[PDB]
Structure formats: C-alpha cells, structure tokens
Amino acid sequence: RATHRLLLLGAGESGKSTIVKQMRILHVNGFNGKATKVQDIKNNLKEAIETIVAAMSNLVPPVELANPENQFRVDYILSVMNVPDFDFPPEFYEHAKALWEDEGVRACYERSNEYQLIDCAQYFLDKIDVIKQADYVPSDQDLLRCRVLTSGIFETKFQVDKVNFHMFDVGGQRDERRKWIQCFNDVTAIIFVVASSSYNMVIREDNQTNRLQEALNLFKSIWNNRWLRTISVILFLNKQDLLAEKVLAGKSKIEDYFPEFARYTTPEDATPEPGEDPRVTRAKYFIRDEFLRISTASGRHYCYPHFTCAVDTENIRRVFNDCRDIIQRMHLRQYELL
Amino acid sequence: XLITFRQWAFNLPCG
Ligand SMILES: Nc1nc2c(ncn2[C@@H]2O[C@H](COP(=O)(O)OP(=O)(O)O)[C@@H](O)[C@H]2O)c(=O)[nH]1
Ligand SMILES: [Cl-]
C-alpha cells in the first residue's frame, strides 16, 4: 500500500483547511469524529456582524446607518464585541438580523475589501434565524463555510483504491527558521491553494500586501527554492465561485489591482464551461497565467493548475480524482528524458 | 522565536 504525503500550502484563508475537511467528507467520516461545531458557526456569525458594524465608522468615506433607529443595536453589538464566553442571548440574534437588513450596514459589507471580513459573512448572516434555533444541527455545507483557525497541523489520512494519502496543512504551525524546510520531507506533491477571488483584498498580516500578490510571492518562493526543486506543485485556483461573483458585479475591476489584466486576452486553449461569462473566463485564466509565468520562468518539478471551489464537495471530488491520477502518475515523469 | 510559513518563505524577521 503506497502512501503519498500531500502538503497543502498557501496564504491564510485561501482554502487549505476546507480542502482537508472535504477529503474527510469524501473519504473519511466528514465532520463526525475537535471538529467544527455549532459554536464555531455562532462565533463566525458574531465575528461577521461585529466586524461589519465596527468598520462603518472607520471607512473613508465613513458609512452611516440608513436607519438611525438601529443605533442602539449598533451600541449593543460593539459593546459585546470582545466579550469572553458570550452566551448568544436572543437579543443578539435580533440585533444582528435587524442590522444585516440595514442599508448602511450592507453598504459597509459591500466595501468589505477595505477591511478584514471572513468569507462566510453573508452566508451565515442570511441564515440567522436557522442558526439561532435550539434544534439547529449544522449541515456539512455550514461546517465547510465556517472559518476556524487551525492550531497546529491540520491533516487527514485516507485510502482510495488501495492508495494511502496523508494530506496536511501547516497554516496553523510555526517552527524554527532553519527547521521549516523539514516540513517538505518525503512530500509527493505540494498542493498550493490560492483565493482567486481575493485580488481586491490585502492580507491580515500587514493590511498592505495585496492578497493575490501575496499568493504569487509565496508560490514564487516555493517554486524557486532549490531544496524543493523535485517536488511538483498541484495548483488549486480556489474560490472560483467568489471570483465569478466579484467579476460579474463590476465593483472592483481586476485591472484596478493588476493593471496588465487590461491587456490580457483569454488563451486559445481555454475550456470555458458552457454559459460562463467571457469576463469570468478571462479573469480566471489570467490569474492562472500569473502563476504559470512563475513556474515556466525557471527543473524536475511541474505545475498542474486546477480551478476549484473548496466548499463544493462535488467540485473537489472531481478535482481530487484528477489529482490522484496526477499523483499516482508523477513517478512516470522521472523516466522521461528531454 | 518561532516563525510562520510566510516569515520563512520571505525570510522575514521573527519579530
Ligand atoms: N464561496 C467560497 N468560500 C470558500 C472557498 N474556500 C474556502 N472558502 C472559505 O474560506 C474560508 C477560509 O478557508 P480556510 O480553509 O479556513 O483557509 P486556510 O487558512 O487556507 O485554511 C472558510 O470560511 C472557508 O469556508 C470556496 O471555494 N468558495
Ligand atoms: Cl490566497
């Protein structure tokens, strides 16, 4: 029984832990046996509404409540923002929902790329009344949307067609500088995950570096590290659903953040899905080609790009089936010449 | 002290 160690890399919030959770759904017991719980969904709900409310005053220009009657709801939300051991009483759900229906709050949500907001904000805020029920058991999709910070390595071990896989994410791990290279030991392939839709956002670590440029810089560092030169990279251009939504909305144009997009044309090898808007096709291949330029500019490793939606179990099932074929057939490239 | 992956990847000071 061959075992393949698969190392998930990528910037924070690109989708690495979601891929692990998807592997567990597909090939282990899902969220059934430190898994994401109801409480994490309530915490995300609270973090979303309190982040949006607090951001209203700080934007330039600032955003006001559309309904000044909701001011006491704002006072409540900000007052419990950092409360340890929040009990989520019924008035919290009342104020959160009523604030989510305030046009000023939504206008602030629409400008979320100007601050730091978790991805699942609208998804959870739109089902406040479902979540607050005492009988509420979260669906797998609820648990996939729930952003939970990993402490330590986040991993899954599973067997498919008599082939063992060990997929692990080191996003929540820290190590001594000279020992970090050891995390790549005996790795069959790196799975590099990119939040394609985050081209208009900046990273939390400094609130200045553009998120996509951060992903390109990370990918460049891995790709050109001579001690990793024999490890092939499977590239997950993730959050395709959020990329399509953002492009079709025209609020943040890609060329406003990556000016060469204005001169980019969709390649002729492109396989746009039927019905895909041409702007979305050009965007997603541009982002792909931003990484492919790095991997072509400089060994015994290749890059295999994939368009993915990490919260879509069926999408990841398909993509991972392609990866297993890529993974089980990577050894064949060792026998090729030139 | 201990550094993150990006501190390693970009040779940033631990801080
Ligand atoms: N709409 C959408 N949301 C995603 C996708 N992938 C991740 N999300 C979310 O993005 C958030 C952060 O993803 P996570 O796996 O925790 O990022 P990590 O820091 O790289 O592990 C989670 O709320 C995930 O549900 C995607 O493909 N589409
Ligand atoms: Cl990213």
Residue numbers in the entry:
A (entry chain A): 38 to 70, 88 to 352, 355 to 394
B (entry chain E): 1 to 15
Copied sentences from the primary study:
The G protein-coupled receptor cascade leading to production of the second messenger cAMP is replete with pharmacologically targetable proteins, with the exception of the Gα subunit, Gαs. We identified two macrocyclic peptides, GN13 and GD20, that antagonize the active and inactive states of Gαs, respectively. Co-crystal structures reveal that GN13 and GD20 distinguish the conformational differences within the switch II/α3 pocket. To increase the probability of selecting function-perturbing hits, we took advantage of the fact that when Gαs switches from the GDP-bound inactive state to the GTP-bound active state, significant conformational changes occur at the switch I, II, and III regions, which are known to bind protein partners such as Gβγ or adenylyl cyclases (AC).
To explore how GD20 favors Gαs/GDP and inhibits GDP dissociation, we solved a structure of the Gαs/GDP/GD20 complex. The structure was determined by molecular replacement and refined to 1.95 Å. Four well-defined water molecules and a number of intramolecular H-bonds constructed a helical secondary structure in GD20. One molecule of GD20 binds to the switch II/α3 pocket in Gαs through electrostatic interactions, H-bonds, and hydrophobic interactions. Specifically, the side chain of GD20 R6 forms a salt bridge with Gαs E268, and this ion pair is stabilized by Gαs N271; the main chain carbonyl oxygen of GD20 A9 forms an H-bond network with Gαs S275 and N279; and the main chain of D229 and the side chain of R231 and W234 in Gαs coordinate a complex H-bond network with I3, W8, N11, L12, C14, and D-tyrosine in GD20. These interactions rearrange the flexible Gαs switch II and bury GD20 F5 and W8 inside of a hydrophobic pocket. The rigidified switch II in Gαs/GTPγS—R231, R232, and W234 in particular—clashes with GD20. However, GD20 binding induces a significant conformational shift at the Gβγ-binding surface by expanding the switch II/α3 pocket. Instead, GD20 phenocopies the effects of Gβγ GDI activity, stabilizing the conformations of switch I, III, and the P loop in the GDP-bound state. Such a conformational lock not only orients Gαs R201 and E50 to directly capture the β-phosphate of GDP, but also inhibits the spontaneously Ras/Helical domain separation by stabilizing H-bonds between Gαs R201 and N98.
